Design a protein around this nucleic acid. Structure first.
Length: 156
RNA sequence: AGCUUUGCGCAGUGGCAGUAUCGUAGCCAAUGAGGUUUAUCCGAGGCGCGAUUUGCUAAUUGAAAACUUCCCAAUAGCCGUGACGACUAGUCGGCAUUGGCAAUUUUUGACAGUCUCGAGACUGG
């Protein structure tokens, strides 16, 4: 309001205002579509791979389940490849679980090691939901408590 | 029967030893430590804290450097002299101590160097 009192800006057209209006309307369409996709992918990924979704987050769980080629290919991958799963001058030897929110929830030098912590345990989680045990996700909850317990252990 | 591999133990030669060797009871660690190289790859301990027995010998200071001393008194050659003694003023033997013992015959150095085949020669300017 303070800088709308002094804008130094000229008015738009009617075509310019309606062009910006439909641009903002399709932008809200893209935002609501993104959140609809997010809700569906978290629901169906908590059904398909509950423990991996609990550890990493179900969108990144779906990304590393897809680029590996499903759960039954994600299990028989080691922990040192699921770290680099989704890789490609921005950061090297990084996968989809380096740019996760739970691996960016810490200082920038605390990052790489944390990737190896989230890659290993979720690999266990991936193996745990390659067979259909722990459908409620208790292995994911226990391992995720272990993850952020180690994160709080490293932090001050 | 011989050869031989791997791990461990013992001893020995040699090498290394504070960017070395360990402890860790605190935490983490193959359910993955730690990764800038080659990363759909590698794979072992890591971070902190804390360390760096025993016998022998030398040397120094110190009065004393840790295994059951100092001090006084006396005892442990010959020419003269004094007595005692012996033998005829003289001689001899032993004992004793109240002066002396580097000037040719002795005990305060004619010795030292050299040369020749047990024996001699040369020099000491």
């Amino acid at each position: 309001s303070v800088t709308a009192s002094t804008t130094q800006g000229q008015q738009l057209s009617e075509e310019e205002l309606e062009r910006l209006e439909e641009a903002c309307d399709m932008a809200l369409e893209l935002n609501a579509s993104k959140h609809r996709i997010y809700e569906y992918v978290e629901s169906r990924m908590s059904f398909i791979a509950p423990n991996l979704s609990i550890i990493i987050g179900a969108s990144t769980a779906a990304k590393i389940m897809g680029v590996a080629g499903g759960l039954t290919n994600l299990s028989k991958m080691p922990a040192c490849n699921i770290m680099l799963l989704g890789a490609q001058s921005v950061l090297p030897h990084t996968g989809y679980i380096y740019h996760s929110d739970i691996v960016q929830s810490l200082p920038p030098d605390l990052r790489r090691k944390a990737a190896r912590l989230v890659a290993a345990k979720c690999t266990l989680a991936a193996r745990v939901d390659s067979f259909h045990e722990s459908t409620e996700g208790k292995v994911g909850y226990e391992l995720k408590d272990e993850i952020e317990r180690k994160f709080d252990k490293w932090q001050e």
